[PDB]
Amino acid sequence: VTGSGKKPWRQKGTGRARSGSIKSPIWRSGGVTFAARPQDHSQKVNKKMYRGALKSILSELVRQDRLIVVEKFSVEAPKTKLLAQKLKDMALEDVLIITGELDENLFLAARNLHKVDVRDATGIDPVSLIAFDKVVMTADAVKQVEEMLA
Amino acid sequence: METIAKHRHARSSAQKVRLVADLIRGKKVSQALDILTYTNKKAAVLVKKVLESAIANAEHNDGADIDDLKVTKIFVDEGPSMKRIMPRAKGRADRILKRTSHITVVVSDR
């Protein structure tokens, strides 16, 4: 805290509570007693624990019928209208599309749909798998994911 | 029916203005004006000006007839104080409070 280190008043003689610093945390405009520092909150996940959680999440999605497997999931043009029509056809609103390798058309089309995400098979995460109501994986994505989780 | 007049931030202590305002309560405005005329108080001057303003508001905005008009309500609230410094002996400093008051007079035909 900005300020000087002078004793605000002398130690004895004044009928005042003994003070030593204008920057005391008891004082208004003084320091914070345990002031925050910028800290790193990320914790460690064992590789096996992370992979076991992914396997458990995928098993749960299959049991809950939230996982939809398909072949090709593409759109002929980078058109949000096209992807929205395709999802409305497939009866999908909140969906996480996991493709073999990222298609530029599909990525550009999905970028403006906020209930729609498009990951690469390598870029799936537990929070997304749980957070989206439907997870549409292609067959190539399923193969890559089982290889990654074996 | 009821007519209010206020002197807000009246430069006087609420205690003294209340001394004066206790004299005219539930009294006809004529008697109240006589009492405030012959009360020897700065607060009496203030309260008389407020009561006259009330009578005038009643006879200009709410109707007429000063005669059928009593001081139904009169109260003195405290207002903001003005803080001043007064030097005392041996370097000490006191704080004077210039106290003010809101004088409110409600007259009415009842």
Partner: peptide, 14 residues
């Protein structure tokens, strides 16, 4: 304030 006078000396209980 900024100036606090020294209190008067106590009675010398000696």
């Amino acid at each position: 304030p900024v100036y606090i006078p020294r209190p008067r000396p106590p009675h010398p209980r000696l």
